[PDB]
Design a protein around this ligand. Structure first.
Ligand SMILES: Nc1ncnc2c1ncn2[C@@H]1O[C@H](COP(=O)(O)OP(=O)(O)O)[C@@H](O)[C@H]1O
Ligand SMILES: [Mg+2]
Lengths: 51, 468, 578
């Protein structure tokens, strides 16, 4: 009974939680990359204000 | 009409190129790009301003140079030349014939983006379609004017199900007494990102059925330019709308593997440095998908209709992925396949619990199919859900703590999954399916049928199984 | 006025030049076709315009003309029994001029200028009027429409038109300073309409559903949110509220949803019956429709137009109910506009000022004392569509901080066809304690005790549901099995309700009260009979179970006769039971 309970219940929930956390972290990293791109664009635009 | 060329190219990078003095290019226009070797490319204006105009190229930018490239205007809005002679032809998604026959003569030239239908001009879909599948016709019935996609996995046979539905579709006018004639039926098949091994199957199935004489095929292959995948469903929907609302055809549109369309849209969006969405996808997919799905329906005062059956493969069978999630919020139901039923040889592997049809309640009933349909569907859903729950309980505890009621519910579940779902290549009428459904409900005792009124259990209850 | 030319076109955003002198949030006409736009940023000689219509085919150099006025609606007689787009244009008038497709550049009037209304004066020369006072009455579909003074107008009446029939644009009252008052007036959609006081709500908003009206009530001036995944029941629940609620005027705002639902509302409603006046149901309904394939920027305007109309009907002493089909589409429109503005996103791509807008929208509800001395109220019910059922996304979290009621939907209940699929464990309501004096007077003195007993039974059932699944249902004692079965009876016989049945679609308060009385009488008799040594499965075979099961299908007029027969059979069966 314990073997069946663990195998059919306990593991898939942990796996789903792991899969959710990975997606959240990846999304945050992608947003950080976008912000870094914008600040680099502003930095390059600053130098051309008066050559 | 005269032509105008622009040679002031100032910047080329990736898919974009800038034209300096093009102040008379309309927003969203189609341009024609020529290089020094004579090869001709296409493109679209995505931004126009006084200082420059931005043009994205439909395919790769190899071989372009600032010295010899010129840009020529084609038309202010992307249009498709449609005709009644397009039936039986094949096209490559951008509109050119690939069957070797001469091109068509357009009766009209229609914008491919379409226009929204006025909600006042619409009318309610109410004509029930008999598809020959018990799990569809009884519990997820399809109505003329509905958009009902199929949620599939990787190795599941969604395409065979779509072909079988296309073969067996009929309207059954006798149940409402609506004469004998058939208003002509048509099929528009659009394939995005399809492979040759798969495309050959659809070609052979259409040839064997003989439905190629009343069908239009738009084919976009995996090695084609990525932009041509975006334009493919829009032209198919334009042709379907033209036929249905100007020649009174009853068309059926099949869009295959819209996951390829969504990945192509992600590529195009990420190529222009935009803020991404849930999983890297663009944040405007909902509008882009709504501009495709919402073109079906029925119009007051007209005889034609458009019916959509999109097909999409769920990535890693995840129902919370952005593509199935955004498809669910727009379309009116879905048919979801199950890998567990496919593993044990059941065909078609349609799973009743995650399946849904929103237009069922106004396409069936008294005077449409018969009186007892709606209550039978509810009773089947409730009893099968209880059986699945009890079966889930058994797999942890074991087959020793079950009351005879729970044993009856398990018997109902395992008899259902065999007799009702698995039918093979059969073609079942609605009466046969309802007789089978009443046969299954007879295994439960009378007092538990709370969903059904006492008149109907006094009429149809008591029939035995007939798989003998 | 100030006139300029187009400098840059990019999506739904147009930048014009030569616009020096235009003001923020004014309405501009863009291009030769006169597309409607709005200023959202001023920069030197240029201005940033968002367009509420499709911008395909425009060219650089086309004229742009500013009107000098903000976005405003027309308020007056003739709005009931009508359907409007996002910027208040009648679709049934657009169709007769354009066809089955909606095209841009069409200009129509919001109120029909050619209909004749029976004017009835109420003031006389020499009177002094203020904002919100009543000048006269005009008949409508059963209602009596009051002609209100604009909130920012005061003066002394010089002359009044006599009784007769006039159009909406003919002046009926002329003031001493030369100001002419007509049967209609305009009001900016982004400004809240003033009131004297706001009152604490003390009367329930009867929705017609058992679980919402009993377990998680909402008041006559409160707000509620109904989040849920796809195919969960948000639209059927909001259309049932439109059909069966006790409000006087219902305003329906379909911000960015399907086009077939609007057809269903336009077809079904003219044939149904108004619950409280006997007329057609469509005579009390106002529709604002902006479908998913309509222009994106018009999603924002439709919400404001709907809430402004609801506020207008509040000032006449009516009780108004407002339904928003989805606010996530409004959030997506804000996100798209902010992306065009190249602003820095805060979280999930949404602009940082989303919460302020959501708070400003929900705050317009409440029970008030109008400027004319009457009493009115507005209720707002807003549906939220989280991506993938994730309740942690910013739209839900910003909504939960202002709403007084939270109706959480579950996909698990929707899979097993257990509708309305309200999660009774995650939902809550903050109006329950303030409605008890009304319940003790209008239904029964013991109603809150019965409700608390049912909630306690549900809590015990949920507690035992963790035990039964992995230990086995047979391991429980007789009392625990009885609790499980009574919880199943409550779940299937009382909480569940079918919105398409001819009888079960509507349920009164007294019918629900009788159902709880039946269930708790049965539970008391069963727990008494268990002490006598009777086996549990013999109790589940009692014929009185079917009487409780079929109770909700009994009609409202036939229910009291059925109730007494059940109240005799329940005692009789358990008396004869061993
Ligand atoms: N009270 C109810 N009774 C019966 N069916 C319901 C009820 N509520 C929802 N449904 C079912 O839900 C389906 C669609 O739900 P819907 O309101 O569209 O949810 P959403 O708007 O979130 O997609 C309908 O086909 C309907 O059969
Ligand atoms: Mg909905």
């Amino acid at each position: 009974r314990r073997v069946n309970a663990l195998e059919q219940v306990v593991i898939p929930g942990i796996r789903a939680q792991i899969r959710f956390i990975q997606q959240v972290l990846e999304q945050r990293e992608r947003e950080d990359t976008f912000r870094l791109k914008r600040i680099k664009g502003k930095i390059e635009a600053r130098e051309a204000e008066e050559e | 009409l005269l032509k105008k060329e622009y040679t002031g190219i100032t910047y080329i990078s990736g898919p974009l190129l800038f034209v300096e003095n093009a102040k008379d290019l309309a927003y969203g226009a189609i341009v024609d790009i020529k290089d020094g070797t004579g090869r001709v490319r296409g493109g679209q204006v995505i931004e126009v301003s006084e200082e420059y105009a931005v043009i994205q190229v439909f395919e790769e930018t190899t071989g372009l140079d600032l010295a010899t490239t010129s840009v020529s205007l084609v038309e202010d809005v992307a249009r498709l030349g449609v005709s009644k002679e397009m039936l039986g032809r094949r096209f490559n998604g951008i509109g050119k014939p690939i069957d070797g026959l001469p091109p068509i003569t357009p009766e009209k030239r229609l914008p491919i983006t379409g226009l929204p239908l006025n909600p006042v001009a619409r009318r309610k879909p109410e004509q029930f379609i008999q598809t020959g599948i018990s799990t569809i016709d009884v519990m997820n019935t399809l109505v003329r004017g509905q958009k009902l996609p199929i949620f599939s996995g990787s190795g599941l046979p969604a395409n065979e199900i779509a072909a079988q539905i296309a073969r067996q579709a009929t309207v059954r006018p006798d149940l409402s007494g609506e004469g004998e004639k058939e208003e002509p039926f048509a099929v528009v098949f659009a394939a995005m990102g399809i492979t040759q091994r798969e495309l050959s199957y659809f070609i052979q199935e259409f040839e064997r059925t003989g439905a190629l004489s009343r069908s239009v095929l738009f084919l976009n292959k995996a090695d084609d330019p990525t932009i041509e995948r975006i334009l493919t469903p829009r032209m198919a929907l334009t042709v379907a709308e033209y036929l249905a609302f100007e020649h009174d055809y009853h068309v059926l549109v099949i869009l295959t593997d819209m996951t390829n369309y969504c990945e192509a849209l992600r590529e195009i969006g990420a190529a222009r440095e935009e803020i991404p969405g849930r999983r890297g996808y663009p944040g405007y997919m909902y509008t882009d998908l709504a501009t495709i799905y919402e073109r079906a329906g029925v119009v007051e005062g007209k005889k034609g209709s458009v019916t959509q059956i999109p097909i999409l493969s769920m990535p890693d069978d995840d129902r919370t992925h952005p593509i199935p999630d955004l498809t669910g919020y727009i379309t009116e139901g879905q048919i979801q396949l199950s890998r567990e039923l496919h593993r044990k040889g059941i065909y078609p592997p349609i799973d009743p619990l995650p399946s849904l049809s929103r237009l069922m309640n106004n396409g069936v009933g008294k005077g449409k199919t018969r009186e007892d349909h709606k209550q039978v569907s509810d009773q089947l859903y409730s009893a099968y859900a209880n059986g699945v729950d009890i079966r889930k309980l058994v797999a942890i505890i074991g087959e020793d703590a079950l009351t005879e009621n729970d044993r009856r519910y398990l018997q109902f579940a395992d008899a259902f999954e065999r007799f009702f779902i698995n039918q093979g290549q059969q073609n079942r009428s609605i009466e046969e399916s309802l007789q089978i459904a009443w046969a299954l409900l007879s295994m439960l005792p009378q007092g538990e049928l709370k969903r059904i009124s006492k008149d109907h259990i006094g009429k149809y209850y008591g029939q035995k199984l007939e798989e003998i | 006025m100030i006139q300029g030319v187009i400098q840059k076109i990019a999506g739904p955003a147009v930048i014009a030049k030569g616009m020096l002198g235009a003001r923020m949030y004014d309405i501009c006409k863009v291009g030769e076709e006169g597309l409607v736009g709005e200023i959202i940023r001023l920069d030197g000689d240029t201005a940033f315009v968002q367009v509420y219509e499709d911008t395909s085919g425009l060219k650089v150099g086309e004229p742009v003309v500013s009107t000098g006025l903000p976005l405003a609606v027309e308020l007056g007689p003739g709005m009931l029994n009508g359907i409007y787009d996002g910027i208040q244009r009648p679709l049934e008038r657009i169709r007769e001029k354009t066809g089955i497709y909606i095209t841009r550049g069409v200009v129509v009037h919001a109120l029909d200028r050619e209909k004749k209304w029976a004017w009835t004066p109420m003031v006389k020369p020499g009177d002094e009027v203020r904002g919100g006072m009543v000048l006269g009455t005009v008949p409508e579909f059963g209602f009596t429409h009051k002609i209100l003074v604009p909130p920012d107008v005061r003066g002394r009446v010089k002359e009044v038109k006599p009784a007769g029939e006039y159009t909406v644009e003919e002046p009926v009252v002329v003031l001493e300073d030369g100001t002419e008052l007509k049967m209609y007036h305009t009001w900016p959609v982004r400004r809240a309409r003033p009131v004297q006081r706001k009152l604490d709500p003390n009367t329930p908003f009867l929705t017609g559903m058992r679980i919402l009206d009993v377990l998680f009530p909402v008041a006559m001036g409160g707000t509620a949110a109904i989040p849920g995944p796809f195919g969960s029941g948000k639209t059927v629940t909001q259309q049932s509220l439109a059909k069966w609620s006790n409000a006087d005027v219902v305003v329906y705002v379909g911000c960015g949803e399907r086009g077939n639902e609007m057809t269903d509302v336009l077809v079904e409603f003219p044939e149904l019956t108004d619950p409280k006046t006997g007329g057609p149901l469509m005579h009390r309904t106002v529709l604002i429709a902006n479908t998913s394939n309509m222009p994106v920027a018009a999603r924002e305007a439709s919400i404001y137009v709907g809430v402004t109309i609801a506020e207008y009907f509040r000032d006449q002493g009516f009780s108004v109910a407002l339904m928003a089909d989805s606010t996530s589409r409004w959030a997506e429109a804000l996100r798209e506009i902010s992306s065009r503005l190249e602003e820095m996103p805060a979280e999930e791509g949404y602009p940082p000022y989303l919460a302020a807008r959501l708070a400003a929208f929900y705050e317009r509800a409440g029970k008030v004392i109008t400027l004319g001395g009457e009493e009115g109220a507005v209720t707002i019910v807003g549906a939220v569509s989280p991506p993938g059922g994730d309740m942690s996304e910013p739209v839900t979290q910003s909504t939960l901080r202002i709403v007084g009621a939270f109706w959480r939907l579950d996909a698990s209940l929707a899979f097993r066809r257990h509708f309305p699929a309200i999660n009774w464990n995650g939902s809550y309501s903050l109006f329950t304690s303030a409605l008890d004096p009304w319940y003790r007077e209008n239904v029964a003195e013991d109603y809150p005790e019965l409700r608390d007993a049912i909630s306690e039974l549900l809590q015990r059932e949920a507690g035992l549901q963790e035990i039964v699944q992995l230990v086995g249902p047979d391991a429980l004692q007789d009392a625990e099995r009885l609790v499980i079965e009574v919880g199943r009876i409550i779940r299937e016989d009382f909480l569940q309700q079918n919105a398409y049945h001819e009888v079960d679609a509507y349920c009164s308060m007294k019918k629900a009260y009788g159902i709880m009385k039946m269930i708790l009488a049965f539970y008391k008799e069963a727990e008494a009979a268990i002490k006598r040594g009777v086996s549990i499965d013999e109790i589940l075979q009692l014929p009185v179970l079917e009487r409780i099961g079929r109770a909700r299908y009994v009609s409202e007029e036939e229910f009291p006769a059925y109730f007494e027969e059940a109240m005799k059979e329940i005692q009789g069966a358990f008396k004869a039971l061993a």
